[PDB]
Design an enzyme around this catalytic site. Structure first.
Site, PDB file in Angstrom:
ATOM      1  CG  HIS A 182      39.954  40.577  33.755  1.00  0.00           C
ATOM      2  ND1 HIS A 182      38.952  40.710  34.693  1.00  0.00           N
ATOM      3  CD2 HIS A 182      40.348  41.834  33.446  1.00  0.00           C
ATOM      4  CE1 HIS A 182      38.752  41.992  34.941  1.00  0.00           C
ATOM      5  NE2 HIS A 182      39.586  42.696  34.197  1.00  0.00           N
ATOM      6  CD  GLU A 193      31.564  46.219  33.967  1.00  0.00           C
ATOM      7  OE1 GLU A 193      30.911  47.181  34.421  1.00  0.00           O
ATOM      8  OE2 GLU A 193      32.600  45.781  34.512  1.00  0.00           O
ATOM      9  CG  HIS A 228      36.012  35.679  36.266  1.00  0.00           C
ATOM     10  ND1 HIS A 228      36.252  36.194  37.522  1.00  0.00           N
ATOM     11  CD2 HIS A 228      36.528  36.572  35.389  1.00  0.00           C
ATOM     12  CE1 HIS A 228      36.889  37.345  37.408  1.00  0.00           C
ATOM     13  NE2 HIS A 228      37.067  37.598  36.125  1.00  0.00           N
ATOM     14  CG  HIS A 277      33.027  37.659  39.831  1.00  0.00           C
ATOM     15  ND1 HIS A 277      33.201  37.534  38.470  1.00  0.00           N
ATOM     16  CD2 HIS A 277      33.667  38.799  40.188  1.00  0.00           C
ATOM     17  CE1 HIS A 277      33.909  38.555  38.022  1.00  0.00           C
ATOM     18  NE2 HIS A 277      34.206  39.337  39.045  1.00  0.00           N
TER      19      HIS A 277
END
Ligand SMILES: *[C@@H]1O[C@H](CO)[C@@H](O[C@@H]2O[C@H](CO)[C@@H](O)[C@H](O)[C@H]2NC(C)=O)[C@H](O)[C@H]1NC(C)=O
Ligand SMILES: [Cu+2]
Length: 223
Positions: free
Chosen positions: A1, A30, A84, A157
């Site tokens: 984020h 996504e 991330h 991740h």
């Protein structure tokens, strides 16, 4: 984020959301086939801007990534979470009007990419742990005029399966001046460049541990 909220030129930052269409929420897109993969978008909300930054060809711009628009610091937590891990990419698209061009479709050509190095350190780990700075080269051989810089940092991740990867990107408005137009990049399209089955999207970065990473998209354009 995280969010690429401000861009630096002539060594000075141009301001939050000035010249950069930013989202109000630091959520990833996504669905690589969704039109939002180009310059963010639904289900996120992106704001418009009427500032076209004047950059002289050949010079560096630096995309400042921030956990949120209201983020004030530059610590690793102020950029993005340490988990991330993934690559960092940048593209350019020749448009008629950088202040209104949608940016979805053909015209994108890669200019920077920083995946996994010989030491196993991801490009995101350097932007996060480098005060959110994402240095990018503006080629000299491209033609002058209006452009759209699409900076991006993907997280892996949870990309063991598709959907899984997390794509964060924000587009900036530029006016390249001084470009010699001594080369024409072979362009791709967003959506269209990335595929859910690519070695860079679908990947297990811990089972087994990876050593060589393949940044999605085309090769880097160099003069
Ligand atoms: C301008 O941007 C380029 C990339 O767009 C930077 O070059 C990278 O710099 C890092 C840090 O040393 C290296 O690890 C990469 O190998 C370099 N890549 C390329 C393609 O050159 C460059 O450092 C930036 N320069 C400034 C002054 O911001
Ligand atoms: Cu996240």
């Amino acid at each position: 984020h995280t969010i690429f909220s401000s861009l630096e030129v002539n060594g000075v930052n141009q301001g939050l959301g000035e010249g950069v269409r930013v989202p109000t929420y630091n959520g990833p897109i996504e669905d690589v086939t969704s039109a939002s993969i180009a310059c963010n978008g639904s289900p996120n909300t992106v704001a418009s801007t009427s500032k076209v930054i004047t950059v002289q060809a050949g010079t560096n711009v630096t995309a400042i990534w921030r956990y949120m628009l209201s983020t004030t610091g530059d610590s690793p937590a102020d950029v993005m979470d340490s988990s991330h891990k993934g690559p960092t990419i940048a593209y350019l698209k020749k448009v008629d009007n950088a202040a209104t061009a949608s940016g979805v479709g053909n015209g994108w050509f890669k200019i920077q990419q920083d995946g996994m190095d010989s030491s196993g350190v991801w490009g995101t780990e350097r932007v996060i742990n480098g005060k959110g700075r994402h240095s990018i080269k503006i080629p000299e051989c491209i033609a002058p005029g209006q452009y759209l810089l699409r900076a991006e940092m993907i997280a892996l991740h949870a990309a063991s399966n598709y959907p899984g990867a997390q794509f964060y990107m924000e587009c900036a408005q530029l006016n390249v001046v001084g470009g010699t137009g001594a080369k024409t990049p072979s362009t791709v399209s967003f959506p269209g460049a990335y595929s859910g089955s690519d070695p860079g999207v679908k990947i297990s970065i811990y089972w087994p541990p990876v050593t060589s990473y393949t940044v999605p998209g085309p090769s880097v354009f160099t003069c």
